[PDB]
Amino acid sequence: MVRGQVFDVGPRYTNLSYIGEGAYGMVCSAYDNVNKVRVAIKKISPFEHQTYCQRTLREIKILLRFRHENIIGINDIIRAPTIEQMKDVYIVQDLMETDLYKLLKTQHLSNDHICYFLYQILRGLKYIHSANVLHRDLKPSNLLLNTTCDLKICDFGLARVADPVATRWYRAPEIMLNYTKSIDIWSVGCILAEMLSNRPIFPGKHYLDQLNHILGILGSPSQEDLNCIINLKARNYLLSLPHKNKVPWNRLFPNADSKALDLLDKMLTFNPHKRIEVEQALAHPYLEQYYDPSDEPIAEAPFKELDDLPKEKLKELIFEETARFQPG
Numbered sequence: 001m002v003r004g005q006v007f008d009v010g011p012r013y014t015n016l017s018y019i020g021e022g023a024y025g026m027v028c029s030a031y032d033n034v035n036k037v038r039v040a041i042k043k044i045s046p047f048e049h050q051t052y053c054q055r056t057l058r059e060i061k062i063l064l065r066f067r068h069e070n071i072i073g074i075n076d077i078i079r080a081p082t083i084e085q086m087k088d089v090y091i092v093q094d095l096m097e098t099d100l101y102k103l104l105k106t107q108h109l110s111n112d113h114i115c116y117f118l119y120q121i122l123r124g125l126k127y128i129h130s131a132n133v134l135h136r137d138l139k140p141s142n143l144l145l146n147t148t149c150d151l152k153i154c155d156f157g158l159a160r161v162a163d164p165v166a167t168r169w170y171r172a173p174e175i176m177l178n179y180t181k182s183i184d185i186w187s188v189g190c191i192l193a194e195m196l197s198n199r200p201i202f203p204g205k206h207y208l209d210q211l212n213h214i215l216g217i218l219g220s221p222s223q224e225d226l227n228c229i230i231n232l233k234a235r236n237y238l239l240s241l242p243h244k245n246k247v248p249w250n251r252l253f254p255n256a257d258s259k260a261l262d263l264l265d266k267m268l269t270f271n272p273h274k275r276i277e278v279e280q281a282l283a284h285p286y287l288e289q290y291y292d293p294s295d296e297p298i299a300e301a302p303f304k305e306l307d308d309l310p311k312e313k314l315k316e317l318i319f320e321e322t323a324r325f326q327p328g
């Protein structure tokens, strides 16, 4: 029992300790008696909502297929032996010490640590994008860190196959104005800016405020930037806004490495067609001390209908996907 909730994971997993909770789940750390290490166990109860069932199936299917040092994996999955009895699914994963959200609230990151965290985010992102997948929800709380500065990207609930919410501070401007892999690069740019000054770069208070924070730093879009906004009302809205001059990156970040600001500028490009791509970002001079393309793997197979399936069919798909972890 954990805080009035049943966590039926044993006998392999013992000594449970509460970590946190979400809308349809609870995370605990536990001791794995087979591997002799503490693990993270997420109890998820999504079967009453369509959206939660989609998030659950996406995370399970994607994470079981992915295998990369900078992406959290799934070690084990616990659920009931019959569909009717299955109310919750327990997802067992590597236990991480902290996340980038917590780290940025408490520590001053050295230029070497910022460089190394950005490198690992992009290294994992290279793999995700080579699988034709968009994470779509990159933010500091989804970047797990261990004692040795190793980083893993987690929470693939909103991930989707490329076809070209607690915070919107990391969402690309085209999401409002209109998506490509370029939406993840924007979120990485926001994270880099946050690592440089320990504060979110575009902390919008409401929906339209998010774009105002973006334009307040980037400046008003150029004529070419505007021409690429196809939607009539969104272009008229952009034209109606007061004029803004670009804030130079070194005024906002006077202590940052000029090479980090050059990369930041390319990731936080208003026009997604002109935004830097993951392989180009890895090869940027800011990351030269870690860049090693022979040690930056790609997915063996591109990843491959859910947004219209009912919750009852998604539960069957979740049951089928988890079957190989059940006893004989």
Ligand SMILES: O=C(N[C@H](CO)c1ccc(F)c(Cl)c1)N1CCc2cnc(NC3CCOCC3)nc2C1
Pocket: 019, 020, 021, 022, 023, 024, 025, 026, 027, 040, 042, 072, 093, 094, 095, 096, 097, 098, 099, 102, 141, 142, 144, 154, 155
């Ligand atoms: O999938 C998640 N988290 C996502 C974040 O949105 C999530 C989803 C549903 C939820 F219901 C909650 Cl609550 C959290 N994981 C699994 C893997 C793991 C491994 N280790 C640590 N360790 C903690 C130690 C304390 O600092 C933070 C990391 N956490 C985690 C969280």
